[PDB]
Amino acid sequence: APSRNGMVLKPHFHKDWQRRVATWFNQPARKIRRRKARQAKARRIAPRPASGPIRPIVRCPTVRYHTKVRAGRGFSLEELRVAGIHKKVARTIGISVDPRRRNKSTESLQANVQRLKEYRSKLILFPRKPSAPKKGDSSAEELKLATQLTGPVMPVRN
Amino acid sequence: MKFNPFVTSDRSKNRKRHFNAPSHIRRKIMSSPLSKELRQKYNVRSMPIRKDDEVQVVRGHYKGQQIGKVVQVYRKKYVIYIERVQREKANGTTVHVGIHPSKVVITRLKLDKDRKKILERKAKSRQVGKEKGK
Amino acid sequence: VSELAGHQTSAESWGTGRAVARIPRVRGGGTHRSGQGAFGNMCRGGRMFAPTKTWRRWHRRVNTTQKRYAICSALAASALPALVMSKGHRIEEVPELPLVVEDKVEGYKKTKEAVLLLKKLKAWNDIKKVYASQRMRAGKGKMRNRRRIQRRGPCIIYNEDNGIIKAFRNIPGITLLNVSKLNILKLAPGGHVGRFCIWTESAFRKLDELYGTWRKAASLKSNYNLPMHKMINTDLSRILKSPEIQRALRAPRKKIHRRVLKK
RNA sequence: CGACUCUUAGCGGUGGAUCACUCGGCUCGUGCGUCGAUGAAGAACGCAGCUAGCUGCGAGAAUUAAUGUGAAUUGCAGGACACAUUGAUCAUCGACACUUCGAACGCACUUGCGGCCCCGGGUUCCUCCCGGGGCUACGCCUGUCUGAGCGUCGCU
RNA sequence: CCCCGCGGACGCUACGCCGCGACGAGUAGGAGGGCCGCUGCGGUGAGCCUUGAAGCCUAGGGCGCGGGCCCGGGUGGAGCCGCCGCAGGUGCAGAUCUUGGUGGUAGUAGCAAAUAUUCAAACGAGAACUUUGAAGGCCGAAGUGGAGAAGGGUUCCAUGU
RNA sequence: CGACCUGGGUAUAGGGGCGAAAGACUAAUCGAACCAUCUAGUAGCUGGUUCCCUCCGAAGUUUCCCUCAGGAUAGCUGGC
RNA sequence: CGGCGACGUCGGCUACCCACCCGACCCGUCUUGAAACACGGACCAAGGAGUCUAACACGUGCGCGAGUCGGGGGCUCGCACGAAAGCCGCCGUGGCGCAAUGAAGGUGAAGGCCGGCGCGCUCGCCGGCCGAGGUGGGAUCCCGAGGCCUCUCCAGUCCGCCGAGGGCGCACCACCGGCCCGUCUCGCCCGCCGCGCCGGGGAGGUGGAGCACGAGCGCACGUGUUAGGACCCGAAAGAUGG
RNA sequence: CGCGACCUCAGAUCAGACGUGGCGACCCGCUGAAUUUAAGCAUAUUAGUCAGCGGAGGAGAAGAAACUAACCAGGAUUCCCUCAGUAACGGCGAGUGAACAGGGAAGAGCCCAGCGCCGAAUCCCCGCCCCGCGGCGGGGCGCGGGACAUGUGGCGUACGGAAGACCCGCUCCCCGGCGCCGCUCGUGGGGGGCCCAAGUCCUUCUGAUCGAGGCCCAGCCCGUGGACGGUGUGAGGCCGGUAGCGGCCCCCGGCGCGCCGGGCCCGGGUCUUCCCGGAGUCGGGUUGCUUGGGAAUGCAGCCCAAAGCGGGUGGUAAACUCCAUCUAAGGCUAAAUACCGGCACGAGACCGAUAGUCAACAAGUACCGUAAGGGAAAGUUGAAAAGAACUUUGAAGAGAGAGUUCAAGAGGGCGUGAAACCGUUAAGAGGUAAACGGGUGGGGUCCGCGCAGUCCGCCCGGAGGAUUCAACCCGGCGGCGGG
Numbered sequence A: 001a002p003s004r005n006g007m008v009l010k011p012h013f014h015k016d017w018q019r020r021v022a023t024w025f026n027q028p029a030r031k032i033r034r035r036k037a038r039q040a041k042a043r044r045i046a047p048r049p050a051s052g053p054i055r056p057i058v059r060c061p062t063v064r065y066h067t068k069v070r071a072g073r074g075f076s077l078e079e080l081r082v083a084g085i086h087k088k089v090a091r092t093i094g095i096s097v098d099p100r101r102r103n104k105s106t107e108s109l110q111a112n113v114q115r116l117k118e119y120r121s122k123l124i125l126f127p128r129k130p131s132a133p134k135k136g137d138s139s140a141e142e143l144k145l146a147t148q149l150t151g152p153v154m155p156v157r158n
Numbered sequence B: 001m002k003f004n005p006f007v008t009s010d011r012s013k014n015r016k017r018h019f020n021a022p023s024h025i026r027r028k029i030m031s032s033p034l035s036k037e038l039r040q041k042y043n044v045r046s047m048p049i050r051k052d053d054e055v056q057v058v059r060g061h062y063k064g065q066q067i068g069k070v071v072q073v074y075r076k077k078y079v080i081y082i083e084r085v086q087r088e089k090a091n092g093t094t095v096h097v098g099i100h101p102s103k104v105v106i107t108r109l110k111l112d113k114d115r116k117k118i119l120e121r122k123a124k125s126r127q128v129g130k131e132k133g134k
Numbered sequence C: 001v002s003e004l005a006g007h008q009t010s011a012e013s014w015g016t017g018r019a020v021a022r023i024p025r026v027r028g029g030g031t032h033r034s035g036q037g038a039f040g041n042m043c044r045g046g047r048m049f050a051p052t053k054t055w056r057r058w059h060r061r062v063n064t065t066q067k068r069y070a071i072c073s074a075l076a077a078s079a080l081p082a083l084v085m086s087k088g089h090r091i092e093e094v095p096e097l098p099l100v101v102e103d104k105v106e107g108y109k110k111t112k113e114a115v116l117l118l119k120k121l122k123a124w125n126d127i128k129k130v131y132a133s134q135r136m137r138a139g140k141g142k143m144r145n146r147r148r149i150q151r152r153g154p155c156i157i158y159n160e161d162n163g164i165i166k167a168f169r170n171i172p173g174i175t176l177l178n179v180s181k182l183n184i185l186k187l188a189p190g191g192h193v194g195r196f197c198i199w200t201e202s203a204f205r206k207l208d209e210l211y212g213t214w215r216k217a218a219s220l221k222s223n224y225n226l227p228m229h230k231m232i233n234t235d236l237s238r239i240l241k242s243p244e245i246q247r248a249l250r251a252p253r254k255k256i257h258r259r260v261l262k263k
Numbered sequence D: 001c002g003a004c005u006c007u008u009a010g011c012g013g014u015g016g017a018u019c020a021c022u023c024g025g026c027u028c029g030u031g032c033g034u035c036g037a038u039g040a041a042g043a044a045c046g047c048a049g050c051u052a053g054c055u056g057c058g059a060g061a062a063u064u065a066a067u068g069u070g071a072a073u074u075g076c077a078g079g080a081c082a083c084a085u086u087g088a089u090c091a092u093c094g095a096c097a098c099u100u101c102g103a104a105c106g107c108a109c110u111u112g113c114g115g116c117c118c119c120g121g122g123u124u125c126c127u128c129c130c131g132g133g134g135c136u137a138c139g140c141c142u143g144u145c146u147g148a149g150c151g152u153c154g155c156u
Numbered sequence E: 001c002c003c004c005g006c007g008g009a010c011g012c013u014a015c016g017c018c019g020c021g022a023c024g025a026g027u028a029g030g031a032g033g034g035c036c037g038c039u040g041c042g043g044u045g046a047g048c049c050u051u052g053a054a055g056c057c058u059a060g061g062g063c064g065c066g067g068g069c070c071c072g073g074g075u076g077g078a079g080c081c082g083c084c085g086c087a088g089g090u091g092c093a094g095a096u097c098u099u100g101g102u103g104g105u106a107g108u109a110g111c112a113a114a115u116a117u118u119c120a121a122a123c124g125a126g127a128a129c130u131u132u133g134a135a136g137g138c139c140g141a142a143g144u145g146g147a148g149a150a151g152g153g154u155u156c157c158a159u160g161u
Numbered sequence F: 001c002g003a004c005c006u007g008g009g010u011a012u013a014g015g016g017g018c019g020a021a022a023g024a025c026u027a028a029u030c031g032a033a034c035c036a037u038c039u040a041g042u043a044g045c046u047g048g049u050u051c052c053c054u055c056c057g058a059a060g061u062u063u064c065c066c067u068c069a070g071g072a073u074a075g076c077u078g079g080c
Numbered sequence G: 001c002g003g004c005g006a007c008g009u010c011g012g013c014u015a016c017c018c019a020c021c022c023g024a025c026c027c028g029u030c031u032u033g034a035a036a037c038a039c040g041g042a043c044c045a046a047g048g049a050g051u052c053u054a055a056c057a058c059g060u061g062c063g064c065g066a067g068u069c070g071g072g073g074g075c076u077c078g079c080a081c082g083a084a085a086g087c088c089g090c091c092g093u094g095g096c097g098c099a100a101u102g103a104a105g106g107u108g109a110a111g112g113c114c115g116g117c118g119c120g121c122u123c124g125c126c127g128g129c130c131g132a133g134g135u136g137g138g139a140u141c142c143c144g145a146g147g148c149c150u151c152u153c154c155a156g157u158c159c160g161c162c163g164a165g166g167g168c169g170c171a172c173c174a175c176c177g178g179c180c181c182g183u184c185u186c187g188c189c190c191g192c193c194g195c196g197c198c199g200g201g202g203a204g205g206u207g208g209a210g211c212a213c214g215a216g217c218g219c220a221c222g223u224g225u226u227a228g229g230a231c232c233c234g235a236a237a238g239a240u241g242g
Numbered sequence H: 001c002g003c004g005a006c007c008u009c010a011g012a013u014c015a016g017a018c019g020u021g022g023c024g025a026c027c028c029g030c031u032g033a034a035u036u037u038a039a040g041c042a043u044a045u046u047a048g049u050c051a052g053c054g055g056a057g058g059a060g061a062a063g064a065a066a067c068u069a070a071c072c073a074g075g076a077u078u079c080c081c082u083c084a085g086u087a088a089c090g091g092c093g094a095g096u097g098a099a100c101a102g103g104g105a106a107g108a109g110c111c112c113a114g115c116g117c118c119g120a121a122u123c124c125c126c127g128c129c130c131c132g133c134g135g136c137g138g139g140g141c142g143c144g145g146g147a148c149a150u151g152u153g154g155c156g157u158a159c160g161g162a163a164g165a166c167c168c169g170c171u172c173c174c175c176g177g178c179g180c181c182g183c184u185c186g187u188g189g190g191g192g193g194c195c196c197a198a199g200u201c202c203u204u205c206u207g208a209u210c211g212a213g214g215c216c217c218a219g220c221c222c223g224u225g226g227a228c229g230g231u232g233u234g235a236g237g238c239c240g241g242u243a244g245c246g247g248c249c250c251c252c253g254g255c256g257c258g259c260c261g262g263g264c265c266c267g268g269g270u271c272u273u274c275c276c277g278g279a280g281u282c283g284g285g286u287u288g289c290u291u292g293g294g295a296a297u298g299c300a301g302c303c304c305a306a307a308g309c310g311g312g313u314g315g316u317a318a319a320c321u322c323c324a325u326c327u328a329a330g331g332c333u334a335a336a337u338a339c340c341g342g343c344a345c346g347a348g349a350c351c352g353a354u355a356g357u358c359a360a361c362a363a364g365u366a367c368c369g370u371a372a373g374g375g376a377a378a379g380u381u382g383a384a385a386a387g388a389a390c391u392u393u394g395a396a397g398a399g400a401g402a403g404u405u406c407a408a409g410a411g412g413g414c415g416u417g418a419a420a421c422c423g424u425u426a427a428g429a430g431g432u433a434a435a436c437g438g439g440u441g442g443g444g445u446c447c448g449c450g451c452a453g454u455c456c457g458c459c460c461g462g463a464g465g466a467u468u469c470a471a472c473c474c475g476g477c478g479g480c481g482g483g
Ligand SMILES: [Mg+2]
Pocket: C005, C006, C045, C046, C047
């Protein structure tokens, strides 16, 4: 019964809600379990940058968000082509190609190929057989300059 | 204080573990201190109580320096029996009084090949701890 | 409690034509349990009234500005001897109440040098009060692992950890706080401000950039400035005795007019 | 004055509240996350020197072996047990063993009734009796052997 | 510009203290205060306790309007409380309330269906009831006899209590 | 001596059975058995609803309602 | 001012028993009305009933304030406490607030004065300033004639008090204008890369949960209403599977 | 009127395997209510929920677009926050109710059929030998069987692919052991075993102490150990433990290099020429269920039944038209996620024997029912049995002495031992049932250790004692004031 003056309230509690109640007492425990799995994963990929591969610059797909830019699933095949790297070896380099994204803009195209080309410069590639450095890198900057990179590979900025 | 997260400080769990202990770790629970002369000659403070070693009661009704030989360790009862620590019942016969081995001090041990080995292993461990604590 | 507690019985209400109350009663006939009341908060072995649930909202969130406000208030109270004494901390032989030692104590390793430091600083009397306050709790807490209780010792607030925690932490009552991350549950143990706190040199200097001054903002909290006063001069005696207040007053009426018996 | 009845107190009964205790729960969290025709879960029946229950076990039956440990088990008895010409107890458990039902498997639920193949005794090979051992469920896959068809063909 | 002198009560936990005037019914109901009470948590009382905790008993002494509380004596034998906050499965005379125990009734109703017992002896501490013997009776072969089927499961048989 | 009485073995199972028919019987339960669950079913109806002082203190009337043992609404009440 | 005080007496209204005088029906409940020939209650002990979650509304306390809030995630010796705490800031995404109105297409909250001028046409150009208007009340504050004194007059030197009147007027209230959105009535202008079934503008009424120099956000507590077993106990039933 | 080949079937206790049943908290596929709410009730709600049936794993399902969107576009799945109690559905009533974008956790991609090329290049089974075992593989050998052209394997899959040339780079794999690393990162990687500090010091309390006082130097001793439990009390130092990048001994695993065994040998660009897709399926009608999906979101039955610049989607039915987007009718795939069953742990502002699980205990037990099924009650002597010898009465139960214990006023359902109820003892009283409120009176048990009754500030007098009172001097320390 309505008493004097209030909201017309319609609680959604007619469906025996007390059996499907999700408590969050394992939230602090889950945060630790996720934290140490992050630490274990980062230390397994010893020089690799601890946070997944590089991601492209991507514009949000709606008039509400199209002013901002973010990181997409991965680089498209056209940006990989004009950067001159093969779509199969790219993911071994740590680049995360996404084949089902298309580029309808040259500025968006050129932005992601400058991101790939200046990622390639910042890359340090360990030779697969350490005894013989064939095409990877120089030993001088291999030793000192090779460290695990925390956080996302160079993040997108508005 | 206790930091190992896999050992419990729960009162009920410790009491349950103590009173339902198997005989082989009930033996360790029944350890007894060694005398000053035994502590100096060896390098071990406490030793699990054996069957036929001399001992003197230091607490309770039967305190004194009468060095009595242990004659039975009753791990079911968590008590040991000593030669002269007895009480006369109504009928006039004598029965032993059980005392916890923590309330006696060992004055001479019963040495065997195993007792020497345990004696030497505790001495080497304390020596290792002492040199680490130099 | 168990969600099944008191309801795994399958009891019927027994009717009303029989000269017994209308509470549900256990079926059967070969047991003591048969024919006894069930399911009721008034029945033995029944379900309690409104069984307690796990989704009881045990946690509360306080605003970050309020939480910092309390920490600032607790820190300000630890520098006033009347408040820390009013917590019963036995600081009469200690000098310079906001008590700072050099960082050499941050690199301590043994409890022997930690006890000697407390004695030399004349902070040991508070430890002896903690020892004398060690006793056994009263009530069901003993059955629930809260057997023994004691007092609160001084708080050692450090910047770096070079063994200071291991050197201390075997003294009853001593709490290490790590100035980078304070705790209102330890700075005001019972909700009462004024805990005895010993600072190291590196911890004391970091405090100013950790909460900021009033003229400059904290560089380690990125938005925080110290809370402002609503009363700068909180001393009534000087204010009320100040001439400007006194010139504006009227003369006091101190004579007492009691009721006069009507002759 | 007795008796009886009522009130109060002392003591004694009836009764088991209160208090103190807790090898039990309840709740939360963590790590694992593993049954079975090589016979599971479950049931039955047995097994101790004295043993009914609980517990443990399976005709090797309150347990064998092995490994750690290192002088007990215990209500009573008993005989052990050199603790090195190798060890009580306990723990672990990877070797061994593991009765009858049960998906339950030869048929059936009556310890009812079979069939085949080997072995031992009675035979003194010939195969009748007794005992022991191994097989004998349904569905289905690959292959094998044996087959059926006025199914489609080839050669006479 | 005090003084032979060197002096001059209490007060004001300001959430405190003091003064004066008026007023005082109360169901349903609302609100305030509680130094009323119970349990547990954080602080605190250099708190209490085997030179005796809790609990309980009390023709003992008191305090408070009251809820209640303190103290003495007894019993008991290991824990407990004050103050500042926190949190409740927090206060019982009723619910034909739940569980347990106990009364009056009350030494009362009752131990009345199918004819019936008596004498002596033995054992035995003890005999209306057991056993033996004697007598009087009953079932009266469609039995109060002798055997089985279902069902029971050791009730069968000895010896002892 | 009969549409007779009766044992054992079988068949029929719950909105179903079976009934020479009484809504009879279906394990002391039948105008729909028993067991567990949905289920702590709903109840405008009945019963109960636990400490103390202090202060204030009613209504059984208006309007609408498948409304007349109930509610909304306005009045009356307390608190801030 | 008097009397009496130890093995006999003094005081103790409290407490135990008894006596007498007056008063006094058995409680709970429903009810207009209960002592009721209305129901429950033989007695004692223990248990026993407005709880928790979520959503609102208002009041109160607190922090910050046109903002506010990390609640989800992430970063910090190795987790006694600590499953806490601290921190992030290009983690503020997002929620609520800061803008309303219309079904919607959509549109979307600043007035007053002074001068010239159009024709100062109930009206266009600007120029200058100011910045939410005005009336009536309005706590508070400001000015204030006149006064009030000293052992006493002449001439003012300092401030203090009362004070008729006057002034600016907070919050808030009543009223009048004004502005934004919808919708009617009337009517004339203006704009252009598109001269259009284009776009914009005015006056006068009316509909809005609006504006008119923000007050919200988060946290806690209380009360009230609700959905949940929902203060506790209680059906006759219904369904599913055996 | 035979003998062969194939096809389609059959038998076998044929050789070798596989499935069945259980648990089921989480997960997948179906099936599926009514109570209840609507103040009645039928659609609606409850609820795609309970009950029912089937199938799994350590997770499962999902999952790499016949997607979202309409932007300057994003880009598998799953989970969290938000979107949002919103769009929408709804006797438009009660009520119900998503998705996109955004920020995070996690992050991973691929394989066939087809179209083609390659002498079936392919696969299983049985024997030989040797390298081996250790869940059984490698090599080769068989004029050894079978499968298979009704299509095995290699290349290849919508992100295009293939084949020829031209150019360029020779750029270099995985799987099994030997020895050692690195010494395996929360510091050992795990499993198991055994060990490692310091008072039983002095005096006292007690039945017993773990209680209480003390332990010179700056202080009993250790402390990286003052968690916990046991022990006749309350123990950091008596015992087990606790702390510790502490010690020792076994067993096992992934890791890097020298060696060996095998196989495995072309990748990218430019040009030319070819090649490209899943059918009783899409889609449509109708019906029933379902969804927020509303002229129909999804699912299914029946009927109709495709196309290839085609087909699906573009949240209002239809026709024309432009555009956007994907590529259905085949398949696999970890992580983030769930977990009231199981194994083993840790903890708690929880409960404390009528509570907390029904079950603290020989509890799913005793017991009840034909059965399905229902289902309790029940903890505590004492530090130690030291569990009452012995004498005596009785037939014995049961007593009286005695004895143990600190205590039997702890004596085997024995910690404490309330109330109701009862026995006895003492005091008082009793014909208007008791009981109660106000007021006294009488008696009694106790209290005031009641019983010659104050204290203490100044002064007067007596009678004594002692430093010393004041004043100065020196030293220390404070309060106040100082251009
Ligand atoms: Mg219960």
